[PDB]
Amino acid sequence: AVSKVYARSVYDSRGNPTVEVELTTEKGVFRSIVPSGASTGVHEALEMRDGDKSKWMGKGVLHAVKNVNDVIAPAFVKANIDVSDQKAVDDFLISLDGTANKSKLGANAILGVSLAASRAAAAEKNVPLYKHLADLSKSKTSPYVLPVPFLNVLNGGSHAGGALALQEFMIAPTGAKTFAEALRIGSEVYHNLKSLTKKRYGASAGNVGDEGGVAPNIQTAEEALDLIVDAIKAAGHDGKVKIGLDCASSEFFKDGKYDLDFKNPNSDKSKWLTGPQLADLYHSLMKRYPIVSIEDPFAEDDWEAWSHFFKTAGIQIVADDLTVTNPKRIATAIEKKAADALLLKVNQIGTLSESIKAAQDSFAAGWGVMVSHRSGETEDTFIADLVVGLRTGQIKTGAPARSERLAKLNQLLRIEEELGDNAVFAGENFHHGDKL
Amino acid sequence: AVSKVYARSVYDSRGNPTVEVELTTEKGVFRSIVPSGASTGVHEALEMRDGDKSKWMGKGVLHAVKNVNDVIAPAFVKANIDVSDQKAVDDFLISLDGTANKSKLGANAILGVSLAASRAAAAEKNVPLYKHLADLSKSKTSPYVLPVPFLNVLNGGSHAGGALALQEFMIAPTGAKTFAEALRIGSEVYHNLKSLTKKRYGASAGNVGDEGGVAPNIQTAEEALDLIVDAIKAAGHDGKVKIGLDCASSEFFKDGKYDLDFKNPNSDKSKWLTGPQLADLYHSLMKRYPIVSIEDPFAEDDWEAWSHFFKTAGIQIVADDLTVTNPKRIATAIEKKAADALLLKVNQIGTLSESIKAAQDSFAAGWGVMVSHRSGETEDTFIADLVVGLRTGQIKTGAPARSERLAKLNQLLRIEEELGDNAVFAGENFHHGDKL
Ligand SMILES: O=C(O)[C@@H](CO)OP(=O)(O)O
Ligand SMILES: O=C(O)[C@@H](CO)OP(=O)(O)O
Ligand SMILES: [Mg+2]
Ligand SMILES: [Mg+2]
């Protein structure tokens, strides 16, 4: 029995408020903290902020906080919902909001409750959260799969600049034999990266992104990937480490074109590329560097450049803003053969049921699932349990810098260790972690 | 009854290994994560790392990990120590090491056990950790004092450069009426700072330090404090926000002189200052900006420049590297009247007893106590409970950016809220938080 449902305002990795939910049951108080993901992806559950500019820069979540405390708690207590029954919990949460995008009560007020409920159902079940999630998702747990961590080491996009349009440059210790080893290789390479970085670009090139990657003032992607390959090498792990890219291409999408040199605005145009021309630039990079994954290569409604590139990619194509974790958007992506992997971001749909539900359909179309963090993270380790229970084989939780990030990586350290022989590391099979 | 004492390797905010201890009792498993503080302070408990350069860059703690697992656990289980009895726990931990500086077993292997024990004693006591700590420290708890957070917003020292020698520039929302309000004011000012920063110095000036402060490439301290005062103003909180400085002066101490322009090395000398000349520069800054605290103004064995400045300071003088949390070093500092506040860093002495014990003597000499984090933090919130239980009135846990940091700030959010009317916020009385 759920006896109390409460919420408070706390801070995220960026110093911006967010919602914290506490759920009391006969077994104790369960907490959840929602991520404040830089919002980007038309067609996602809406975020609810005060907009009061004289407070938190207008990013308070005092409403959302209210939505929980004054609206949801009362009704939820009353409902006497068996927390074990996750669909039941989310159906009830969605029923109260009544909008398709959670804009009445707001996706931050609903997630919190939805994530706390699952923790309270694990305690009651007397199982570790990953196990509960395996059970809600009807995933194989014989053995459990630990995933490769896609670590953001070098940031672009949002963080600084030259023309380097590209957003995230990830390393994936695919060659590791354990999660624990993948993280060490990961870390070793990362430190290398910083030194190489500080030497070439200045001590300043060294301070980090929102996610922990160094944010050197670079021009081109080549120059970025050259920098990373030197760190792999230097770290002594050539061959064990692969690269992943997050183009976050909606970002430089203009006039049906793509601007690989933004940050002028002497918006140099004739250089601007078309779906197909970009496709060629990607293919270029593909052969020159050990890239095994590409997220958002084309813009979010640029259905034809996706479909077209996908035909000849030959590597994992991750859909993040094209699908915004919306099964409606997934189904189309699936029928258009736009990609073959889904960036699962829970606060994009706003409910745990809905999140599992979207991974389940991705997995049934033979897609992979990269579980993901938001730009604005917390100390909450929910996504560590989540990639394991879903058995995806891959997670993107940032660089091995900032505890909003190590927090999840440390958590997998703990899960792996606890699983003993019952866990196998995804490695080279990260993409179909689930079929493993 | 302590039934098992185990340890594993996990990561810190910097991606460098550190020790994690798990203590099993009849009430459950208690955990502690030790901070990897950039070591600086001759005369502190020694840090224990593998030094194996082919692993973790030679920063493994696999030994330390071993010291716990193979040496300490066995003996500790056997000892059948009442965890309630903290001195007893630490006496036993120190007895096994037998060095004054914890160099046999290493201060990281001993801290972990010492911090887990206290959490296991709270659970058993059935009180919240801050309360247990109040009890171990024999501190007033009527009411409890929430402290002002000294938030690192702008970093120098270790992070980048011009000549700006100074290390940390802190903001202290002294004028707030609640902790919850101090953090908001704090955060509001911080975001302001970033924008001002990005505008004047480039998008790059915007990425952050190890602690979360922006790390603009600045020259002088004036230019740094000018930048901060504009953010206070701009944020609309002039008068409520005060400044704290961490000169970390050991850093530019050379030939009995201080180099305020390091980063040449066309070690420009005739400009180099003497204790007294620096004292004058500080006094300058003191009148020009709302500075209410200064940490490490003079070098760690530069006893005479401290004593001398202290005479006419008229603000809080924090001893960090001069005292390295060593009561032996404190007593001297006290008899020499070098400072009037102690930076308590637990992994500097290596035991909880020893830490409380040093605050107790600082407090008896009429000093204040600023509880502190390390450069290399974790998701562990131990220091939040610790500043409250000690009733210091002040804590330095970084900027309101990075969860190794918000993690402790969120925790105080929670404690304040739980204490209800039983907690008063230190405010303007942060320095003698304890007499309050
Ligand atoms: O974690 C993510 O993948 C990033 C973008 O890919 O999140 P945000 O959208 O908040 O920047
Ligand atoms: O937290 C601290 O005060 C800093 C220095 O003052 O720690 P470190 O010594 O690790 O840099
Ligand atoms: Mg993306
Ligand atoms: Mg210091």
Full DSSP string of B94-125: HHHH-STTSTTT-HHHHHHHHHHHHHHHHHHH
C-alpha distances in angstroms, B122 versus A218, B144, B358? 51, 17, 22
**Discontinuities after residues in chain B (C–N over 2.5 A):** none
All residues at 6 or more sequence positions from A278 whose CB lies less than 8 Å from its CB, including other chains? A249, A258, A260, A297, A298, A305
Domain final residue, candidates B72, B106, B126: B126
Please indicate whether, in this complex, the C-beta atoms of A159 and B55 are within 8 angstroms of each other.
no
**A41 dihedral zone (left: phi>0; alpha: psi -120 to 50; beta):** left
Residues in chain A: 436
* Residue nearest ligand 1's atom 1 by CA: A374
**Pair of tokens at residue B340:** 């009037």
Cα B169 to Cα B214: distance, rounded to the nearest angstrom:
10
Distance A312 CA to ligand 1 centre (A): 26
Which residues neighbour ligand 3 (ion) by CB within 5 Å? A 246, 248, 295, 320
- Of the CA atoms within 13 Å of residue A407, those in its CB half-sphere come to 25
What is the rounded CA–CA span in Å between residue B341 and residue B367? 5
Whether residue A302 lies within 8 A of chain B, CB to CB, comes out as no
CA of A217 to the centre of ligand 1 (A): 20
Q: For residue B266, which phi and psi values (nearest 5 degrees)? A: -115, 60
Say if the Cβ atoms of B55 and A184 lie within 8 Å. yes
Alpha helix positions (H), A126-272: 129-137, 179-201, 222-234
Domain boundary among A63, A98, A126: A126
Nearest CA in chain B to A209: B207
Are B8 and A404 within 8 A, CB to CB?
Answer: no
Cross-chain residue pair A377–B13, CB shorter than 8 Å: no
Residue stretches of the annotated binding site of A for Mg(2+)? 246, 295, 320
Q: What sign for the dihedral angle of Cα B417, B420, B423, B426?
A: positive
User: Are A15 and B403 a contacting pair at CB < 8 A?
Assistant: no
**DSSP string across B136-200:** HHT---SSEEEPEE-EEEEE-TTS--SSB---EEEEE-TT-SSHHHHHHHHHHHHHHHHHHHHHH
Tokens at residue B49, please?
Answer: 């790392």
Residues with CB under 5 A from ligand 4 (ion): B 246, 248, 295, 320
Q: Using an 8 Å CB-CB cutoff, list chain A residues near B56.
A: 184, 187-188
**Cα B61 from Cα B46, distance rounded (Å):** 12
Q: CA-to-CA distance for B84 and B207, rounded, in angstroms?
A: 44
Q: Of A190, A187, A242, which is closest to residue A213 (Cα–Cα)? A: A190
**Of A44, A188, A211, A404, which one is the catalytic site residue?**
A211
Q: Say yes or no: A309 and A199 in one domain.
A: yes
Per DSSP, the residues of B265-298 read SS---SS-B-HHHHHHHHHHHHHHS-EEEEE--S
H-helix segments, A311-402: 327-336, 352-364, 382-390
Question: Which helix (H) or strand (E) covers residue B224, if one does?
Answer: helix B222-234
Token pair listed for A272: 């601007």
List the single residue in A11, A406, A414 with the smallest CB-CB distance to B400.
A11
With an 8 Å Cβ cutoff, is A273 touching chain B? no
Tokens coding A376? 């604005």
How far is residue B377's CA from residue B38's CA, in Å, rounded to a whole number? Answer: 10
Residue closest to B152 by CA, chosen among A15, A89, A272, A257? A15
Task: Please report, as a single letter, which amino acid is at residue A294.
Answer: I
Helices (H) and strands (E) in chain A, counts: 13, 16
Same domain, A96 and A141: no
Contact check, Cβ <8 Å, A11/B188: no
Q: How far is the CA of B407 from the centre of ligand 3 (A)?
A: 25
User: Do B177 and B100 share a domain, yes or no?
Assistant: no
Judged by CB atoms closer than 8 Å, whether chains meet at B403 and A399 is answered as no
Nearest to B406 among A12, A57, A190 (CB): A12
Structural Rg of chain B based on CA atoms: 21
| Residues forming beta bridges with residue B371, ordered by sequence position | B344, B395
A159 CB near a chain B CB, below 8 Å?
Answer: yes
CA distance A88 to A83: 8
- Return d(Cα A114, Cα A40) in angstroms, integer: 22
Helix, strand or coil for residue A319? strand
> Nearest 5 degrees, angle CA B150-CA B152-CA B153?
125
Question: What's the distance, CA B102 to chain centroid?
Answer: 20
A216: closest CA of chain B, how far (Å) = 8
First to last CA, chain A: 37
Of B207, B400, B407, the CB nearest to A403: B407
Inspect the interface and report whether the beta carbons of B14 and A401 lie closer than 8 Å: yes
**Which contiguous run of DSSP H or E holds residue A394?**
strand A394-396
Close Cβ partners of B391 (under 8 Å, ≥ 6 residues apart) = B134, B137, B139, B140, B141, B144, B145, B433, B434, B436
Which of the listed residues B159, B211, B345 should we mutate to test ligand 2's pocket, taking the one with most ligand atoms within 8 A of CB? B345
CA distances from A369 to A92, A352, A356, A381 (A): 27, 15, 11, 18
Question: Nearest CB to A406: which of B11, B184, B205?
Answer: B11
Closest to B11 measured CA to CA, from A255, A145, A149, A29: A149
Residues B280 and B384 in one domain: yes
CA of B415 to nearest chain A CA: how many angstroms apart? Answer: 12
Instruction: Say whether both B59 and B188 belong to one domain.
Output: no
CB B129, CB B409: distance < 8 Å? no
Contact present, A213 and A190 (Cβ < 8 Å):
no
User: Cα of A199 to ligand 4 centre, how many Å?
Assistant: 26
B418: annotated active-site residue: no
> Which-ligand-closest: CA of B321?
4
Catalytic residue among A194, A242, A345, A408: A345
A378 touches chain B (CB under 8 A): yes
Residues B268 and B324 in one domain: yes
Say what the resolution is, in angstroms.
Answer: 2.2
Q: What is the CATH number of the domain that holds A433?
A: 3.20.20.120
CA angle A380, B47, B167 (to 5 degrees): 70
Going by C-alpha positions, the residue among B434, B433, B418, B424 that lies closest to residue B129 is B418
Residue A71 is part of a domain; what is its CATH number? 3.30.390.10
Kindly state the helix (H) or strand (E) to which residue A148 belongs, with its residue range.
Answer: strand A148-149
Which of B32, B126, B210, B406 is most worth mutating to test chain A (most A CB atoms within 10 A of its CB)? Answer: B406
From ligand 1's centre to the CA of A194, what distance in Å? Answer: 22
Among B126, B144, B173, the domain-final residue is B126
Cβ < 6 A, ligand 1 pocket: A 37-38, 40, 246, 248, 320, 343, 372-375, 396
Interface mutation target, options B6, B9, B13, B34, chain A, most CBs of A under 10 Å: B13
Q: Is B90 exposed, middle or buried (0-12, 13-18, 19+ CB in 10 A)?
A: buried
Q: What is the SS3 assignment for A423?
A: strand
Residue type, B116: A
The structure was resolved experimentally with X-ray
Q: Which residue of A has its CA nearest to B381?
A: A379
Cβ within 8 Å, pair A15-B191: yes
Buried b (16+ CB within 10 A) or exposed e, A226-250: ebbbebbebbebeebbbbbbbbbbb
B53 to B59, B60, B113, B280, B386: CA distances (angstroms) = 8, 9, 27, 45, 35
Residue B429 sits in the same domain as residue B330: yes
Ligand 2 atom at shortest distance from the alpha carbon of B210: 11
Chain B residues touching A184 at Cβ < 8 A: 55-56
Regarding whether A430 and A339 lie in a shared domain, the answer is yes
**A288 and A312 together in one domain:** yes
Q: Are residues A185 and A313 in the same domain?
A: yes
> Within this chain, do residues A60 and A205 fall inside the same structural domain, yes or no?
no
Residues B59, B154 within the same domain: no
> What domain range includes position A381?
127-436
Catalytic annotation, pick one of B240, B345, B377, B408: B345
In chain A, the number of structural domains is: 2
How many C-beta atoms surround the C-beta of residue A4 within 10 A?
A: 12
Strands A151-155 and A168-172: antiparallel
Report d(CA B260, CA B174) in Å as an integer.
29
- Residues on chain B touching A156 (C-beta within 8 angstroms): none
Partner residue opposite B402 with nearest CB, options A190, A400, A402: A402
B345 is catalytic: yes
